[PDB]
Design an enzyme around this catalytic site. Sequence first.
Site, PDB file in Angstrom:
ATOM      1  N   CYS A  64       4.180  19.838 -16.860  1.00 43.67           N
ATOM      2  CA  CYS A  64       4.640  18.880 -17.853  1.00 43.67           C
ATOM      3  C   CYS A  64       5.653  19.516 -18.789  1.00 43.67           C
ATOM      4  O   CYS A  64       5.465  20.632 -19.252  1.00 43.67           O
ATOM      5  CB  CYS A  64       3.437  18.396 -18.656  1.00 43.67           C
ATOM      6  SG  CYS A  64       3.764  17.012 -19.728  1.00 43.67           S
ATOM      7  N   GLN A 124       0.812  -1.200   0.000  1.00 42.84           N
ATOM      8  CA  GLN A 124       0.000   0.000   0.000  1.00 42.84           C
ATOM      9  C   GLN A 124       0.852   1.259   0.000  1.00 42.84           C
ATOM     10  O   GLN A 124       0.313   2.351  -0.208  1.00 42.84           O
ATOM     11  CB  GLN A 124      -0.860  -0.005   1.269  1.00 42.84           C
ATOM     12  CG  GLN A 124      -1.742  -1.244   1.389  1.00 42.84           C
ATOM     13  CD  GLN A 124      -2.209  -1.539   2.787  1.00 42.84           C
ATOM     14  OE1 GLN A 124      -2.130  -0.702   3.709  1.00 42.84           O
ATOM     15  NE2 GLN A 124      -2.684  -2.750   2.967  1.00 42.84           N
ATOM     16  N   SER A 146      -2.989  -0.922   9.110  1.00 45.77           N
ATOM     17  CA  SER A 146      -4.077  -0.716  10.045  1.00 45.77           C
ATOM     18  C   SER A 146      -5.361  -1.400   9.597  1.00 45.77           C
ATOM     19  O   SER A 146      -6.298  -1.499  10.393  1.00 45.77           O
ATOM     20  CB  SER A 146      -4.290   0.781  10.261  1.00 45.77           C
ATOM     21  OG  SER A 146      -4.589   1.422   9.042  1.00 45.77           O
ATOM     22  N   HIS A 202      -0.789   1.726  -4.975  1.00 50.08           N
ATOM     23  CA  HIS A 202      -1.240   3.104  -4.867  1.00 50.08           C
ATOM     24  C   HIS A 202      -0.287   4.084  -5.537  1.00 50.08           C
ATOM     25  O   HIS A 202      -0.386   5.287  -5.289  1.00 50.08           O
ATOM     26  CB  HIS A 202      -1.423   3.499  -3.396  1.00 50.08           C
ATOM     27  CG  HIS A 202      -2.487   2.732  -2.681  1.00 50.08           C
ATOM     28  ND1 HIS A 202      -2.330   2.299  -1.384  1.00 50.08           N
ATOM     29  CD2 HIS A 202      -3.722   2.329  -3.062  1.00 50.08           C
ATOM     30  CE1 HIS A 202      -3.415   1.656  -0.998  1.00 50.08           C
ATOM     31  NE2 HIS A 202      -4.277   1.659  -1.998  1.00 50.08           N
ATOM     32  N   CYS A 235       7.718  -4.796  13.204  1.00 51.06           N
ATOM     33  CA  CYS A 235       7.923  -5.756  12.127  1.00 51.06           C
ATOM     34  C   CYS A 235       9.408  -6.003  11.882  1.00 51.06           C
ATOM     35  O   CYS A 235       9.803  -7.117  11.516  1.00 51.06           O
ATOM     36  CB  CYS A 235       7.210  -5.258  10.863  1.00 51.06           C
ATOM     37  SG  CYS A 235       5.406  -4.974  11.077  1.00 51.06           S
ATOM     38  N   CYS A 289      -2.041  15.535 -20.427  1.00 50.45           N
ATOM     39  CA  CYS A 289      -1.714  14.516 -21.428  1.00 50.45           C
ATOM     40  C   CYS A 289      -1.642  13.106 -20.864  1.00 50.45           C
ATOM     41  O   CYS A 289      -1.567  12.146 -21.643  1.00 50.45           O
ATOM     42  CB  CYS A 289      -0.399  14.856 -22.160  1.00 50.45           C
ATOM     43  SG  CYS A 289       1.100  14.601 -21.176  1.00 50.45           S
ATOM     44  N   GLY A 340       2.244  -4.414   9.185  1.00 49.76           N
ATOM     45  CA  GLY A 340       2.230  -2.981   9.381  1.00 49.76           C
ATOM     46  C   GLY A 340       1.104  -2.253   8.693  1.00 49.76           C
ATOM     47  O   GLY A 340       1.286  -1.108   8.266  1.00 49.76           O
TER      48      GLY A 340
END
Lengths: 269, 9
Positions: free
Chosen positions: A174, A107, A218, A125, A260, A136, A216
Amino acid sequence: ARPSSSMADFRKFFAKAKHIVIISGAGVSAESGVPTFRGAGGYWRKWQAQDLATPLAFAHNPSRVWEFYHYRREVMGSKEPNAGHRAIAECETRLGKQGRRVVVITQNIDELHRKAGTKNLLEIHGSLFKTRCTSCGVVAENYKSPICPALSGKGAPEPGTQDASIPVEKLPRCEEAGCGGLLRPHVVWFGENLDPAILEEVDRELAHCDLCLVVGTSSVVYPAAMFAPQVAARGVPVAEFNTETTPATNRFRFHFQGPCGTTLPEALA
Amino acid sequence: XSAIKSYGS
Ligand code: NA
Ligand SMILES: [Zn+2]
């Protein structure tokens, strides 16, 4: 429905697994010192990530959203993968030589799994270090510090910091010939669809998984929060590695507390 | 399962 806390039992499942899916969230980045701007203590100025990472926020105040992402880009320059990222990458490599598959579905937008050398990686993501042109559509890697001159020194996180209020023409633009469009982070925002091709890859990995690790996260942001429960509901063993319990904890077979970076090196040895 | 990112209530 309380999950097991027995690492010895988990290790017997791990020893037999041929198709491991590892889902990671913001806690893994937080263990590298990355500010996530989520949870009880996570705020940039007076906002959390889910307040600014939205199309409406970007439409109303693109300068403020860009200040937020600029700050995060610049801080990331000083952050490194932690022992959790490294254990995950080393496990993938070792199992791959045995004909066993490990895939990471993250994520996170921080590229820390990538920096740690993970190869089978789905960044569901997007990335802090990619731009998309709103005119564009081109997607590009961008690591420039600062991403544009107007953002230099901006994005300070303290409450009461005034908006930089950069004119849109001076935000990242851009550089493709004849376009000139406003760039945005190539990050999936709250309210936007995840990429269908990525979701199809996720679906295939989950459908074939024989062990899932949820690390890790939620387990409050969808769709990702449903991934491990979907596997568990078919009977597939899921181990949650998290400093806290979550709304999904009791769906899973194992729950391992602590950082972790402390638990995964042992679990994945 | 939705392809829309949502901070669950
Ligand atoms: Na998370
Ligand atoms: Zn463009």
